[PDB]
Amino acid sequence: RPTFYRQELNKTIWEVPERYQNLSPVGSGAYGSVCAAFDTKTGHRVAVKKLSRPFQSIIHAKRTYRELRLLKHMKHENVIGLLDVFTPARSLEEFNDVYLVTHLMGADLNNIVKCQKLTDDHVQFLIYQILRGLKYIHSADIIHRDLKPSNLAVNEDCELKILDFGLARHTDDEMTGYVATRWYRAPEIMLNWMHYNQTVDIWSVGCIMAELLTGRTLFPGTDHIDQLKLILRLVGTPGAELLKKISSESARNYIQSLAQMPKMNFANVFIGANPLAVDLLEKMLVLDSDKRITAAQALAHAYFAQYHDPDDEPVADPYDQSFESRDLLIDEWKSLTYDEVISFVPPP
Ligand SMILES: COc1ccc(C(N)=S)cn1
Ligand SMILES: [Cl-]
Ligand SMILES: [Cl-]
Ligand SMILES: [Cl-]
Numbered sequence: 001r002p003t004f005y006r007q008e009l010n011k012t013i014w015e016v017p018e019r020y021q022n023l024s025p026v027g028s029g030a031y032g033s034v035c036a037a038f039d040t041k042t043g044h045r046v047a048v049k050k051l052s053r054p055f056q057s058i059i060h061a062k063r064t065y066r067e068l069r070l071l072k073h074m075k076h077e078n079v080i081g082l083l084d085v086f087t088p089a090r091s092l093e094e095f096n097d098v099y100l101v102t103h104l105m106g107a108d109l110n111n112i113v114k115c116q117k118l119t120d121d122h123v124q125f126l127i128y129q130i131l132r133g134l135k136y137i138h139s140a141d142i143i144h145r146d147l148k149p150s151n152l153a154v155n156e157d158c159e160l161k162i163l164d165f166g167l168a169r170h171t172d173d174e175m176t177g178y179v180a181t182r183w184y185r186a187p188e189i190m191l192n193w194m195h196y197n198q199t200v201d202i203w204s205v206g207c208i209m210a211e212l213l214t215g216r217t218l219f220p221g222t223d224h225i226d227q228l229k230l231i232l233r234l235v236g237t238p239g240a241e242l243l244k245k246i247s248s249e250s251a252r253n254y255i256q257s258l259a260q261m262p263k264m265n266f267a268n269v270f271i272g273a274n275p276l277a278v279d280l281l282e283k284m285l286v287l288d289s290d291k292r293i294t295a296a297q298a299l300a301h302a303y304f305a306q307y308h309d310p311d312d313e314p315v316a317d318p319y320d321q322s323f324e325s326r327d328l329l330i331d332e333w334k335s336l337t338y339d340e341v342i343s344f345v346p347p348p
């Protein structure tokens with residue numbers, strides 16, 4: 001057990017191993033209560049997150065366990081990973097606080113590229129890395145559900161990592177109005193058309209790629225209905241085959257009140273773009289999720305010819321999430337979390 005020291009940060013007392021020095025608050029709080037630090041064991045600048053009231057309710061205790069399980073599993077160059085996890089507690093009986101350590105991420109795609117169009121070679125490399133990480137995530141049967149520019153960390157060498165695992169589900173209010181937390185969502189999850197699956201993430205990648213190419217949000221709706229109208233103008237109204245699959249009778253009835261529209265010509269929407277980029281966007285932005293291209297298929301598309309290497313696009317170890325359908329008491333979720341803290345093995 002390392003020696004811990006204490007100091008006052010973010011309105012509370014933090015207690016951390018000596019290896020972590022020069023702690024200072026960072027960020028806007030989107031991922032939790034976080035400080036930057038220097039890790040003397042590894043030489044990295046790191047982010048240290050102190051969980052707020054991790055075991056105050058059944059919902060919060062299970063969410064803490066979920067975040068730790070997801071972060072311990074992710075081991076890929078284009079996905080956030082766990083450098084360390086610790087508690088000052090010496091036993092389960094005194095366990096109360098959890099701290100997580102990751103690489104410090106300076107900039108995201110949003111704060112870097114807002115209102116700006118990038119060159120085609122840059123778009124190729126950035127979207128390639130998103131898809132490489134997504135192939136890994138989906139191979140573990142994990143659905144991200146919230147891919148958007150603020151969840152993509154990028155460094156000076158245009159290297160990219162996917163963020164946002166195991167945090168609270170987004171609320172109805174967070175999704176209301178003229179807000180970026182809805183602009184990248186697939187229509188079937190935005191409107192609860194049907195039981196969704198991992199194909200929702202490919203819709204989000206299409207929205208991101210379009211925005212890197214034009215410098216503009218693809219579907220900046222002022223509310224759910226305005227956004228649906230923008231989507232259907234581009235990709236066309238649903239045909240009878242997809243209407244069948246909308247298991248919400250009320251949603252199905254609203255869609256049929258709208259006048260029918262054909263799919264638009266994407267070469268006239270994305271004027272001047274690489275024809276291979278136009279072709280890939282047409283295969284991502286398909287209304288029927290059954291027919292969208294997958295991450296593994298998209299890596300082999302000719303748009304990525306200068307980066308694609310099928311021997312360097314790895315998949316994940318199996319991920320057991322049977323706990324997600326399990327009902328337990330607060331102290332049982334807390335005991336499971338403690339076991340996962342003390343069993344952590346740091347990366348090589
Ligand atoms: C220590 O910094 C952290 C910890 C966890 C997470 C996520 N759950 S994505 C993000 N930042
Ligand atoms: Cl230490
Ligand atoms: Cl990482
Ligand atoms: Cl503790």
Ligand SMILES: [Cl-]
Pocket residue numbers: 110148149150151180
């Ligand atoms: Cl964003």
Ligand SMILES: [Cl-]
Pocket residue numbers: 145146168169170
């Ligand atoms: Cl969500």
Ligand SMILES: [Cl-]
Pocket residue numbers: 318319320321
């Ligand atoms: Cl597992």
Ligand SMILES: [Mg+2]
Pocket residue numbers: 146164167170
């Ligand atoms: Mg999110």
